[PDB]
Amino acid sequence: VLSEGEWQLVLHVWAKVEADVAGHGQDILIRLFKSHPETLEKFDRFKHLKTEAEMKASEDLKKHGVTVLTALGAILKKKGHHEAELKPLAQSHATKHKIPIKYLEFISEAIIHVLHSRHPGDFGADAQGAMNKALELFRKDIAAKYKELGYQG
């Protein structure tokens, strides 16, 4: 499981991504596109965005980061029982956007990178391990959905 303890470490630091959802989402999506450029090819809107300055200036990119981070957060707060919210995500991601599960792993590490970037005294080894554990669960339940629809494998 995640224990009660670890969900607590998870939701404690999410509450301070909540205080600036938009600069967080923006850092994460740039960390992604930067570490893994083939991900940008999945977005039609964002493939004009060659440099990092252009990325940071795009308002459209920032709105997206808000969309992902508040869907993500809605899932984290559901802790454990997160099916209602994770199903629609899986459907669209598998059968529309064509987002391989591997990319969900890339974005997980960008999230943990970015929260290390901004949250030292709240993001220590025990919260990192909680967080990694909660991105895992998320990635595994999506993966189940994917198997079932006949994507990825």
The crossing angle, in degrees rounded to 10, of helices 83-92 and 59-76 is 140
Q: Which is nearer to ligand HEM, 32 or 127 (CB)?
A: 32
How far is Cα 118 from Cα 131, in angstroms, rounded to an integer?
15
Binding range to ligand HEM, per CB under 6 A, among 40-48, 53-61, 115-123, 145-153 = 40-48
**Alpha carbon distance 93, 128 (integer Å):** 26
Mask 43-82, x = binds ligand HEM (CB under 6 A)?
A: x-x------------------x--xx--xx----------
Q: Is 36 annotated as a binding residue?
A: no
The one segment of 19-27, 39-47, 50-58, 117-125 that binds ligand HEM by CB under 6 A: 39-47
The residue sitting closest to ligand HEM, measured at its beta carbon, is: 71
Site string for ligand HEM, 11-30 (x = CB under 6 A): --------------------
Count of residues interacting with ligand HEM (CB under 6 A): 17
> How many residues comprise the chain?
153
Contact between 76 and 85 (Cβ < 8 Å): no
Q: Are 25 and 62 in contact (CB under 8 A)?
A: yes
As to burial, measured by CB atoms within 10 angstroms (0-12 exposed, 13-18 middle, 19+ buried), residue 53 is exposed
Binding residues for ligand HEM, per CB under 6 A?
39, 42-43, 45, 64, 67-68, 71-72, 89, 92-93, 97, 99, 103-104, 107
